DNA sequence: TGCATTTCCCGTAAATCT
DNA sequence: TGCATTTCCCGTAAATCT
């Protein structure tokens, strides 16, 4: 939806469109008058070799009118240029930069709308206006060549008008070249900006100046680790080469809007080994999953007498060799994008920024709404801020460092916050998908606050939550059944590993768990999912000559 | 252990060794006499320019003696050559060829002893004898150059003696070049002669002529699909290239005997795609797993004035792209090696030979004793010949075709004999390993003959056997418990898939299977493994603040 | 050494051949 | 089309780096 700032932008772009038409009009008038003047002059000389009365006066008067039309045109052109310069900045430095920011956010699972359509229409309109304006300026030049005098408006301003129009266009083209789809392995659509060597990844660029004349004209060359990974910048770092079809012609193929774009598929990265390097300094100068790289795109455009070098790059990418490095790699991409809008700070992790629990929590919810249908409730969310910040009320300004979020292991645990959490999402995906869908799982809640169930709610009322001690990820629940109940003895079984969920699903465990009590009688999977809902309405939906005797496995607690 | 034929061989090789020493002796005598004759002659001429009485007689007599010694040497050399020619054939065409045959057999799991030691000692001894013999022959030549006459034994025979010795040596060197370790992926040690593109494989060659002078002198080049896959032979076939270190210098490294050998590791195959081919005719001219290739080794030896081109090749190899093709690929390697001793018939599967149940059964047992501690009992073996040949008594001359063994699916099944069986072995490996070890599993027995248990043995007596209907492979057992037993109602549960064995082991199923009968009471895992052994002595060996409630899964038949 | 990181390769699933 | 065959790539385990 349009904001007011975009409203004005569209408005101004139209005013510019209008002015250019008016000037085009004014150019036609001055040309015709110049032709009329030229013929009249010719006719007058071709006889002054008897001079018709008043015709000399007409010639002189035509000339004066020409002069004035020229002065006029030249100052309206200058004013237009200044307005193009002002608005172009709004277009490129404000609206386009905003898009790039929201693209970062969309990569890490945030509210999208990274649609380039409006921007492309804006950019193309401005570009057309600039090129037509340059054509009028070129025309003024050829008008001066046919007719000129001492104090000619064209001779004393035109060069500056040309310089300004060319600089504007040149810069507009360069801003227009962007990475529409950031590097991502199609196999891990929710993990853009993380590439594993040997696995195909794809990326796409777009030129927001929609000029049909340029269809199939430009050749885009992509590479990784250019320039800054040749002379000055980072050190100790690994270096890679892109393998696969290195170049790609830009065209209007997909036809959606017929926008100029170039898509690269089947790309692969391979470490460039041997030679001379270092690995000097601390952390071997950043661990593998914290090292950042840039994929660059370059091309040259020769358009209407101008040569313009276009270049753009991806957001920093983390390169891994094995998939087991992805959780950590992702955390890096989260932190980077959550905390900065600089598109090329590869040394970011030398001294990472600190985030607030606010921004960290949002980002965390996104991670869930991406892979699943819904994110995190503040019950599960707030009990998470506790697992990091300890006791308290409200967590807005509470600072979360990179070390706390992922770099170092949690309190007494032998794993990091992010990794434990990523492993959970992977569990909620490979199994328990819809079983997590609606509001089913409490998921995250302290053994403590896991008291406000059977101990306030009738015996039977159970819970659905994750194993806090498990690195790989595991699941569990609630129920009061063992010995002579004192004042409601709350319980949980030992969490089920990813393999343990191959043996029987969770809502199947929940609606197929009797509990063989000391009495030798298998008692019961407690009723009422926490609030007051009998297990059935929620969990019942996911449950299910001489022949071999069909069987089905169950564990159901042994005592 | 030495056979009588090998005894004679060793004997003859020694006789040859002896003769060469005797001739070496005879050469020394003739040389000295020639020197004596030469000096005497010199001395006699240097004065006949008065001649000492009787000295002319001595000179003449020395000459006659020389002549006779020469005739003698020349005929003993000829006889020796004929004996070297006879024995060499026994060495190379009989004993070495036998080794190659038993190497084939060892590849497909048969009784090994493919030790090259004896052969290498035999070959090296003969080679040394031949080279020394050639040196005596060369010497005869330089003796003739210093002293000769009309009718000289050396001039009229020596060229033929040279030709024969060189031909013998040349052929001995060529026979001596062999593939000691056939192409095999170290990852699948029991599957030699089957290579999957992209996976490393290793192979090794040996030169049985143990000459230290040649250490590090020869460079061996390996390749696949040479010559015959350039011009005349097979058609429609795929073609490959060996990637990795293509050449390898031959040396005496491992030092075990210090035998000359060249080992190639880290080799990889890749399909050579594009160009011009065909895939014309039926079966696209043999399916992938029936297509055969040869890996060739070549080198040149320049030794004591001779240039000898050595070449050897592997046994035909089947090339696959995915591991799922290995069962079929192996069957091909089994059939080939079980039925022929031709080392290079790549068109074998155009018209495969027929085997007898005898040879087919042996080979089948081998497949078990390879991967496990023991093969197949005739109970399990004979009940197998029934699954292929139907009813009968004795199966010796019963022909088994390639189609019956593997090419076409079994009777009413949607899979082939070999594949079902290979899948079983893979099951007996990944799980139930020792649980198969001793004599535990009956494994293969008709539902029919699976009557001679509870129905002749007390109720309780169970069985251990494989799923006949399962492609992927599965397992099952015996027990009489359901309703009011009539006259012993024999039973089996639905077989456990490879994944079903991750849920609980077989001897754990067997000693943890109660059977919840209609009476709501889980009854019992029947006692006495078939003969009369209470399940325990055999199967019992493989069985095994606020804490989470430790659990353990069981299926135990639901009725 | 123990650790960080990369390589190997099965087995499954998707892709391409034919 | 449906099939034979090859390619893709995770995830585990072994290997190499440092």
From Swiss-Prot, chains A, B:
Forms a homodimer or a heterodimer with a related family member (at least STAT1). Component of a promoter-binding complex composed of STAT3, NFATC3 and NFATC4; complex formation is enhanced by calcineurin. Interacts with IL31RA, NCOA1, PELP1, SIPAR, SOCS7, STATIP1 and TMF1. Interacts with IL23R in presence of IL23. Interacts (via SH2 domain) with NLK. Interacts with ARL2BP; the interaction is enhanced by LIF and JAK1 expression. Interacts with KPNA4 and KPNA5; KPNA4 may be the primary mediator of nuclear import. One of its GO terms (molecular function) is identical protein binding. Residues 436-526 form the SH2 domain. Involved in the gp130-mediated signaling pathway. Expressed in ventricular cardiomyocytes (at protein level). Expressed in the lung (at protein level). Expressed in the liver, spleen and kidney. Belongs to the transcription factor STAT family. Keywords: Acetylation, Activator, Acute phase, Cytoplasm, DNA-binding, Nucleus, Phosphoprotein, SH2 domain, Transcription, Transcription regulation. Disruption phenotype: Early embryonic lethality, day 6.5-7.5. Conditional, tissue specific mutants are variably viable and show diverse defects including obesity, diabetes, thermal dysregulation and infertility. Signal transducer and transcription activator that mediates cellular responses to interleukins, KITLG/SCF, LEP and other growth factors. Once activated, recruits coactivators, such as NCOA1 or MED1, to the promoter region of the target gene. May mediate cellular responses to activated FGFR1, FGFR2, FGFR3 and FGFR4. Upon activation of IL6ST/gp130 signaling by interleukin-6 (IL6), binds to the IL6-responsive elements identified in the promoters of various acute-phase protein genes. Activated by IL31 through IL31RA. It is found in: Cytoplasm; Nucleus. A motif (Essential for nuclear import) lies at residues 15-27. The modification N6-acetyllysine is found at residues 457, 471, 487, 541, 550. The modification Phosphothreonine is found at residue 557. Induction: Induced by methicillin-resistant S.aureus infection in the lung. One of its GO terms (biological process) is positive regulation of DNA-templated transcription. The modification Allysine is found at residues 457, 471, 487, 541. One of its GO terms (cellular component) is RNA polymerase II transcription regulator complex. Signal peptide: none annotated. This is Signal transducer and activator of transcription 3. The modification Phosphotyrosine is found at residues 496, 548. It comes from Mus musculus. Activated through tyrosine phosphorylation by BMX. Tyrosine phosphorylated in response to IL6, IL11, CNTF, LIF, KITLG/SCF, CSF1, EGF, PDGF, IFN-alpha, LEP and OSM. Activated KIT promotes phosphorylation on tyrosine residues and subsequent translocation to the nucleus. Tyrosine phosphorylated in response to constitutively activated FGFR1, FGFR2, FGFR3 and FGFR4. Phosphorylated on serine upon DNA damage, probably by ATM or ATR. Serine phosphorylation is important for the formation of stable DNA-binding STAT3 homodimers and maximal transcriptional activity.
């Amino acid at each position: 939806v349009v904001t007011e700032k975009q409203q004005m932008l569209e408005q101004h772009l139209q005013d510019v469109r209008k002015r250019v038409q008016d000037l085009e009009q004014k150019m036609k008038v001055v040309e015709n008058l110049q032709d009329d003047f030229d013929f009249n002059y010719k006719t007058l000389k071709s006889q002054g070799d008897s001079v018709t009365r008043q015709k000399m006066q007409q010639l002189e008067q035509m000339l004066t009118a020409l002069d004035q039309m020229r002065r006029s045109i030249v100052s309206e052109l200058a004013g237009l240029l200044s307005a193009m310069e002002y608005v172009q900045k709004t277009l490129t430095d404000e609206e386009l930069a905003d898009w790039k920011r929201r693209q970062q956010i969309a990569c890490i699972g945030g509210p999208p709308n990274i649609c380039l359509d409006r921007l492309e229409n804006w950019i193309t309109s401005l570009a057309e206006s600039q090129l037509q304006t340059r054509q009028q300026i070129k025309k003024l030049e050829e008008l001066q060549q046919k007719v000129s005098y001492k104090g000619d408006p064209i001779v004393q301003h035109r060069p500056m008008l040309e310089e300004r129009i060319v600089e504007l266009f040149r810069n507009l083209m360069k801003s227009a070249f962007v990475v529409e789809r950031q590097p991502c392995m199609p196999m891990h659509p929710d993990r853009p900006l993380v590439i594993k060597t040997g696995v195909q990844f794809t990326t796409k660029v777009r030129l927001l100046v929609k000029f049909p004349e340029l269809n199939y004209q430009l050749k885009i060359k992509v590479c990784i680790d250019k320039d800054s990974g040749d002379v000055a910048a980072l050190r100790g770092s690994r270096k890679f080469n892109i393998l696969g079809t290195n170049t790609k012609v830009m065209n209007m193929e997909e036809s959606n809007n017929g926008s100029l774009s170039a898509e690269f598929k089947h790309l692969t990265l391979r470490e460039q080994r041997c030679g001379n390097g270092g690995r000097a300094n601390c952390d071997a100068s950043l661990i593998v999953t914290e090292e950042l790289h840039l994929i660059t795109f370059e091309t040259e455009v020769y358009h209407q007498g101008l040569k313009i070098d276009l270049e753009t790059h991806s957001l920093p990418v983390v390169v891994i060799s094995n998939i087991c490095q992805m959780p950590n790699a992702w955390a890096s991409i989260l932190w980077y994008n959550m905390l900065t809008n600089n598109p090329k700070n590869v040394n970011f992790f030398t001294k990472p920024p600190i985030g607030t629990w606010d921004q960290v929590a949002e980002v965390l919810s996104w991670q869930f709404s991406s892979t699943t249908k819904r994110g995190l409730s503040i019950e599960q969310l707030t009990t998470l801020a506790e697992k990091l910040l300890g006791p308290g009320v409200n967590y807005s300004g509470c600072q979360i460092t990179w070390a706390k979020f992922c770099k170092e292991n949690m309190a007494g645990k032998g794993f990091s916050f992010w990794v434990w959490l990523d492993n959970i999402i992977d569990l909620v995906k490979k199994y328990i998908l819809a079983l997590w869908n609606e509001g089913y799982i409490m998921g995250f809640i302290s053994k403590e606050r896991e008291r406000a169930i059977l101990s306030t709610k009738p015996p039977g009322t159970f819970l659905l939550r994750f194993s806090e001690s498990s690195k790989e990820g595991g699941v569990t629940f609630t129920w009061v059944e063992k010995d002579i109940s004192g004042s409601t003895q709350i319980q949980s079984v030992e969490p089920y590993t990813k393999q343990q969920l191959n043996n029987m699903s969770f809502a199947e465990i929940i609606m197929g768990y009797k509990i063989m009590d000391a009495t030798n009688i298998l008692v019961s999977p407690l009723v009422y999912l926490y609030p007051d809902i009998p297990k059935e309405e929620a969990f019942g939906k996911y449950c299910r000559a001489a022949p071999y005797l069909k069987t089905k496995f169950i564990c159901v607690t042994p005592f």
